[model samples]
Target chain A: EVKVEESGGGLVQPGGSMKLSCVASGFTFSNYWMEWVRQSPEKGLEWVAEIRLKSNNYATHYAESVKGRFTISRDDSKSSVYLQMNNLRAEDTGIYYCTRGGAVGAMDYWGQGTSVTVSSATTTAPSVYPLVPGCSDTSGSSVTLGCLVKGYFPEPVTVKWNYGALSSGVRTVSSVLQSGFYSLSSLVTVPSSTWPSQTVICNVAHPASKVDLIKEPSGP
Target chain B: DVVLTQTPLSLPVRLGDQASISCRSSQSLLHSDGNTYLHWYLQKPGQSPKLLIYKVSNRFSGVPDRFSGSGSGTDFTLKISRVEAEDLGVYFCSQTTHVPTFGGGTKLEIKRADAAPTVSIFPPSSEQLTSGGASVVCFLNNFYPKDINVKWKIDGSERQNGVLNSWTDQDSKDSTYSMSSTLTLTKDEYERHNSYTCEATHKTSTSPIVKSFNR
Candidate 1:
């Protein structure tokens, strides 16, 4: 029945500050220790800070990298813990998580990650490319289509297929940070019977650009 | 890489009862594609691992409704509404949100009455000796709860090398299990009139069940 939920994360300008909150339920908040961890491609999983009640007061610890810039606190009445970080930077752009445990490295419970992005530039729109047909079986039963969405920022995008035939498979891989932008790919499987005769469209929605993009199979 | 830790490494269950296992990851499993790539699998006694749950709570095709998954990000749970005989094995939780990582497996065992195995030792037959090196066989039959350890000793010294153990086989009629261990000996060791001892240790037995073969 134990659960921990973190406050939603969002964009923060470089040099700006933000406070993240973690609410706990189904267990006593003060009885157990709470920790904050963040993951980035560069550092991987790094411990940020930890807090717990000691005797009547609270004891807190922070990672060396965030010691002076990060503060950890808890509200026993609200059953919540808070992390306040000052001087956000590009290095701080990552997923932040909250965990519950009896000790530092023994965290047993965790909350859904909250993504935080620290940037000083404006949102970049994504480039949607036409669907490309991939390898098909000799029986010609089904054909795989791939769509590439490249060069975007602030990271969220959606890709959908507009087709009459039911798709056998559909998957969108997670975005990869490259240079200063993000890129991702989506794949869908459709019956070979449809082929070029059927007008299939790839609809891409990048809210950051405030516009929707559409593309079709290039050749016929 | 993500680290997944599972609690209660061993789970003893009864038929028709429920079972649950917890998998906690060191990092959130939620990916940018809006999918949490946590999956659950069961590796039954000697068979390949079968996928039970994928993308967190979604059950794989052909999987029974009795199995379920829940929770999000770093903490997840896999539940079996009703444990069956075939569910006796190990459960694993895997994640691909980052680098692929799998949790330490949780073994599911049937809770049954403890029964010691009948232990027996047989000397090398003429046919076996003529084929190659002399080999002594130790058989354990009619054991409950399957896990047992067998050791071989020749002339009071424990033999560690050249000892082969076989997989446990179950009796279809009585639900009991059996296993065997073979000890290979040199021709000189077999002809020296030495005593070979086979000791079987089971959870039900207070001490090892000893059987000896004297040539």
Candidate 2:
């Protein structure tokens, strides 16, 4: 019989790419398919794909619907292979491996593994929210303000709108930041009177890679 | 993720042909300690694979010096100095640095017909190991990989399953590759040497290997 483990090194940034490796021993150098699998910082195994050393071809280890993004490669001379993921995301944090993926979803064999973190780049912004004072019913009658940040390297960062003041759906606003350090903003229009007691937030708890979302104040 | 990229086919070495096998790791097999995680093995047609060279040479407890291992970095080589009469069959090198990965395997055959060292094997060292703990540990001086499926057979019937343990490909400086199978032995079977066995099988078994061992 035979057994194997992972090699090492898999560190990447959100837009920064990284590679992980797996190597087997005691068996024939050829004759087997080496595959790679991924795990979300939170969730089960995610199939990336595998490398056919015989012909250097690739087999799909990812779920049937997904495309592109994930793949695997092998080198006989060095007797090893790699799994590369592009445009890293906050979800891509967890144990990864170069192993034998049997049939479909089953990950029977695995290597030691490497961990890569995509640190979110930080963006500087004015501390206070922009205020709109003298305005008509549509403008003065209501206005929405938000505490937003842009261009953080690690997508894993949390977005939060502090307590009840922000919880009022009509008072707070939020947006998704893209990999290029671009900040997306939503048009805010809310009446100051409607802001009874509410807050809204999108926190990247384990901003780097871990933990889950904890609403800042609960209800909006 | 660690990937185990193995060579395609194992070329059979003729009786006089030189037998050289290399297992390069995707990463470094060297652990924090200065030792290799690579190891080489040999299987004679119908028998189990025995340890050849482990941790890059120095030989297992009783292994013959003819089986040599030497190499560094990701390119570690396993060389058998002068193929003897008994060295025919498949040869493979494996790495256990991280998780664990093995080469596809290389078969070494004698081009022409002649007597090879193809001989019977001796059982590894076995002891009570643990009282009340039934399974027996057949200690072999070889580096056996863990991917192989091992079944525990008792007497003439297949026994209940047990856990199969193998070494990590972390360091080669120390003699590791300790594979173990635990089975609940009866008070009577515990004293017998030929009653229990740990049979190993692979997904691809060109040469069948079914061996039974005990104290």
Candidate 3:
């Protein structure tokens, strides 16, 4: 598999600096856009930073997370992208990873992550909560179920769907909030004729906390 | 970056009905050079999306005049004079501002309607005779169902050289239409003292409209 790995995890004092690196292999290094992202226990996946080649020129689209205090630079010859942050805050303590954007502009390819922590005030994760799950009778014999998540930052998170023993589903785009946070929602459908009274699960996993939160419809 | 959001996720249009889709951009689309980069597209089911309007109101080379676009700055709209069965599909509004983006999209569906057009004889738009030749055109106005049959004759004899073209009228809220058929007469053909006629047969009526002129 094409792979990316993050390293340099440790404590960084406030107002100080820390650097993290992502080394990649298994594909053409310069052929695609690369990004540095982070996840917090409270906030979900936040874009953090990105670097890409457009029209034969380099461009960057950085999220508010590291907009001014962090620098995103890549070494094409080294097959790596680096993120350096100054004036670090406790919120910066979290898991960081490198990602490759996919066909629909979603981050489908990801690297193994590394974690960091700040020694000061015990950091409370951003708002990592799921919405009320919904179900709709799409057809005479089929039903669709879904959930929504919002107010997340430093973006490392996972959302999966499962109905009985059946696994796998689809997702919608992660919308960018006015405050630079992220919100995600997705749906899954099943032929109610074949599976009755089945349970639809919305499982969201956080990389920073190494935990998964489960959300499901409340009913008989 | 410009983001577009289309309204009324879907539309159902009678075969000869008119429709309007609006695409509102998140930012001013007017460029510093005095032109807009907003565009409209139609993606038929199982087919690739085709560009309909570019630079705002200008239609693509192959787009019908019936499909017109308007609006400027952050607000833009795409209007279809009459809906055709082939027009049923998702319509998207996109921008070409370096970091271009597309609207969610609006889908069009056809509703069935049956109506026949009224026909009239018109001398070509401009009657000036050039050295090449002279021509006469017949107008077909306000028809529904979009499908119409046209024919031309010289002295009651079938003439296959006649050309017919039709288009929807977007300015109207209903599915009214306008089209024309033309027949070219050589300098010699015009002096033949023969009678020329145009016929339009539509589904609403079993009999066709036949109009003739004697020169």
Candidate 4:
């Protein structure tokens, strides 16, 4: 749908590269600055960096978030901005938007976000919710608690467990989505000895700054 | 639970005075979450409320450091810009960490007369939405006629909407009315894994007003 002669295809193959344009139609280009942001798979918008049109590259202040794979350019002559990221991976899927000025670190003043997904990374899961077994030992066991968060995207963030500081056992947090934002899961396996009457805080955070929590054992 | 009350629901703070926003919680929000979730907002006359403070007293994102939120547990406060003519209208206090509920707002006008017609929405949030289910509502506390009409619309397309009979109720003071509307539907009907922005409009006496929600 987006026709950009400079950057065609709109997609990159595995280990391949891509480039796209967010051609702004009716805005004063020099009056405002544009920035690029990446909404992590299930995380919030990470202010990728601010675009510097003169140099045809992103400024270092915000560029530190990622590397050479991405580039930002604006046609001051035409009043359009381009968000191009090279190399492809399943993790390279999300809604990319353009903003006037760097509104905070996020796209506080976002243009309709662009939904994109690479073909490589895909997951075959029945549901996106937690399904780990119980860790109800009197002492502690390496209880592996798992959960999947499906059916949400950009600005949708939920922290399954925030047990002060997670330690003891090993765990993993990963997710996959068709494109756009993704449903994610966080797993933590505590030592068999750390399971008890203590509180295990599992929080689901939303973009509106609200969080809901559930504790283990479920009692007073 | 020290309740912080902002009486007058609508107050007019003049161009040189101070605009105060009070946040009273059913319980002391000062504990557990730390006063870190408290925030104040100012929706200039016809605009959406902008973030004044977030995380209780921390300056919100993209906000001028001038806007501040300070106070102890229950009696929290939000102050602003000396008081400009542009800073007119409703100010709200919300607990960002709590169950996403915004308090009845106060409108600041040019002095002695601070009262303005204030309408609002309630239960400002939705639980995990199922692809095929009906789990949504509207809190129209400002809809004077508690028993007004509630209808659903997707960007004005006006599809066949339903109200779970919208079992409603109310308890009013002076001239304010409390109202609610309930609707049921399968998330799948709208499409699985997609968000449908919705609006709950009140057929108020003057104009049919609406409150929009984003997934």
Q: Pick the candidate with the highest lDDT.
A: 1
TM-score of each: 0.42, 0.27, 0.31, 0.31
Error of 3 at A13 (Å): 63
lDDT of 2 by residue, B114-190 (tens): 21111111122122223333434322222222244556666767766443233222112221122333354554555
Which residue ranges in model 4 land beyond 4 Å of their true spot?
A: A1-13, A25-27, A53-62, A102-108, A121-220, B1-215
B-chain TM-score of model 2: 0.48
Q: Candidate 1: DockQ?
A: 0.01
- Expressed as tens digits, the lDDT of each residue in A163-196 for candidate 4 is 4465422222333333444454444545545654
lDDT of 1 by residue, B9-28 (tens): 99887677999999999987
Q: What digit string (tens of lDDT, one per residue) describes model 1 on residues A1-220?
A: 6677887566678998999989989987878888787867566556688787766468887776787888999888989999998998888888787877533124446676677878897778887543342221232225545455666877666677774243334544556565676766555556667766777777777755556777766432
Task: Indicate the residue-level lDDT of B128 in model 1.
Answer: 40
* Separate DockQ for every predicted complex: 0.01, 0.01, 0.01, 0.01
* Residues B1-215 of candidate 3: C-alpha lDDT, one tens digit per residue: 45567897877676667899998988887777776777786766433355678778877666899999998557888989977767778887767543545677886756555656655443322222443445555555556665688888878778886353434322123444445565656766656746777898988898888866665
Q: State which candidate, 1 or 3, has the greater lDDT.
A: 1
